[PDB]
């Protein structure tokens, strides 16, 4: 009930194009979020509230964001993106 991850991005994209994802709307109800860990669903990862990824192959990818708060609690949320050739 405290901390929530939120993922903002496009539901579709194209192979080879840089796609911007944001965690900006993530929240700790009683403190601050200190880190943003992304997994783009193709083995790639990144850190930072606003992160970027290009997919190398068509597919449907489940992007996850794990946020950590200033109490060390974590929360994860998912976002599905369909990448066409």
Curated annotation (Swiss-Prot):
Subcellular location: Secreted
Domain of life of the organism encoding this protein: Bacteria
PTM comment text: Upon purification gives 67 kDa, 78 kDa, 82 kDa and 116 kDa (full-length) proteins all of which have the same N-terminus; only the longest form digests insoluble collagen.
Positions annotated to bind Ca(2+) 2: 28, 30, 69
Free-text biotechnology note from the record: Widely used for tissue dissociation due to their potent activity on connective tissue. A mix of ColG and ColH is used for isolation of pancreatic islet cells for subsequent transplantation.
Additional remark text: Clostridial collagenases enable the bacteria to infiltrate and colonize host tissue, and contribute to gas gangrene (myonecrosis) pathogenesis.
Protein name per the record: Collagenase ColG
Protein species of origin: Hathewaya histolytica
Part of the intact protein present: 799 to 880 of 1118
């Amino acid at each position: 009930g405290g901390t929530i991850a939120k993922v903002t991005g496009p539901s579709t994209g194209a192979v080879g194009r840089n796609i911007e994802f944001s965690g900006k709307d993530s929240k700790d109800e009683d403190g601050k979020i200190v880190s943003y860990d992304w997994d783009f669903g193709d083995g790639a990862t990144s850190r930072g509230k606003n992160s970027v990824h290009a997919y190398k192959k068509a597919g449907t990818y489940n992007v996850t964001l794990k946020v950590t708060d200033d109490k060390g609690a974590t929360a994860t949320e998912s976002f599905t993106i369909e990448i066409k050739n």
